[PDB]
Amino acid sequence: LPIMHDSDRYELVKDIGSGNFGVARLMRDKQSNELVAVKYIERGEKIAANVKREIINHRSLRHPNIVRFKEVILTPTHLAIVMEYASGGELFERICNAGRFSEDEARFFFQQLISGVSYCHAMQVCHRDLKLENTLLDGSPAPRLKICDFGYTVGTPAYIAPEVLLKKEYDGKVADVWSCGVTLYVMLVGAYPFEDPEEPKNFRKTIHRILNVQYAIPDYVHISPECRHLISRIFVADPAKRISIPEIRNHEWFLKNLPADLMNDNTMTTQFDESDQPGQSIEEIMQIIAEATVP
C-alpha cells in the first residue's frame, strides 16, 4: 500500500486486506465525517478501459442501499479510488448472530434490498452483476443494507438461479429476483433454502435441489401466508413465470409498513449531504484517470 496522503481532508483509520473491499485502506473524511474505503491501482498498469467504465458507471449510482462512489485521487504512485465503506459487517453474520430474523425484521431488510436492486435495474445498461450473498450493513445502530456493485471466495450455489446453471442465455433481472428470494429465505429461516439442512455442503446435492426447486420451510418457523406466497412466486424454476421486481413492489407482504423514506439518504433520523461529498465532474474524473496512466 502507498503511504498516507491527503491527510488534510482524510484521517487514516486502518489498513485492511480482507472483505468485500479487499485490500483497502479505511479513512474518515474530516469534512463530511463519512467513513470510506480507499482502493489503489498501480499507475499506468490496470488503468485500462475496464477500470474507466467501472468508475463512470458506478459514479452514477446514488441510492442509500448501494455502496457509493466518492472520488478518485491521484497519488505519485497509484490511482486512489475512494468509496463509501459499510462498517456493520455482512447481512449474513447478523442473521447468524440472531439465529433467524422475525417476519417484521426480514421485511425491513427485504424492502431495502428490493429498492436497491430496482434502482440498479433502472440505472445499469448491461446487467447480470449482483453479488447479493455478500450484502453488507452500514455502521448505523439501525442497520441500512448496502449492496456492493464494484470490483477493482465464491459462495453458495443456492444463490444461482436454475436458468443461470442450465441455459446459455438468460435475463439477469429475473435471476436477481431468485437471489433476493434466497436472501429472504435465509433471513427468515437462518439457513440456505436448497443446501443440505446444515452439516454437508454437497454442491452436487444443492444443485440438484435448486434445479428441482426443492425447498422446505421447517415446521418450527411460522411464516404468514402472504410471506409464504411471495416465496412460492420467487422460487419458480421457469424464469418467464417468476414474479418480477415491480410485481414484488405491489405484493401485500412487501407493502406492509413500507417506509416512505426508502430512497432518501437524509431523513428525520439520518444525516447526509450530497454537497459534502467530493462530487467531481466526470471531466475532472477522466482527467485524473488519463493523468494516472503516466507512471
Swiss-Prot record:
Expressed in seedlings, leaves, flowers, stems, and roots, but restricted to guard cells and vascular tissue. Residues 10-254 form the Protein kinase domain. Its EC number is 2.7.11.1. ATP binds at I16, G17, S18, G19, N20, F21, G22, V23, A24, K39. The modification Phosphoserine is found at S7, S18, S32. Kinase activity enhanced by ABA and low humidity. Repressed by PP2CA independently of its phosphatase activity. Probably inactivated by ABI1. Repressed by TOPP1. Negatively regulated by ABI2. Interacts with ABI1, PP2CA and SLAC1. Interacts with B'ALPHA, B'BETA, B'DELTA, PP2AA2, PP2AA3, PP2A1 and PP2A2. Associates with MAPKKK18 within the nucleus. Interacts with ABI2. This is Serine/threonine-protein kinase SRK2E. The lineage of its organism: Eukaryota, Viridiplantae, Streptophyta, Embryophyta, Tracheophyta.
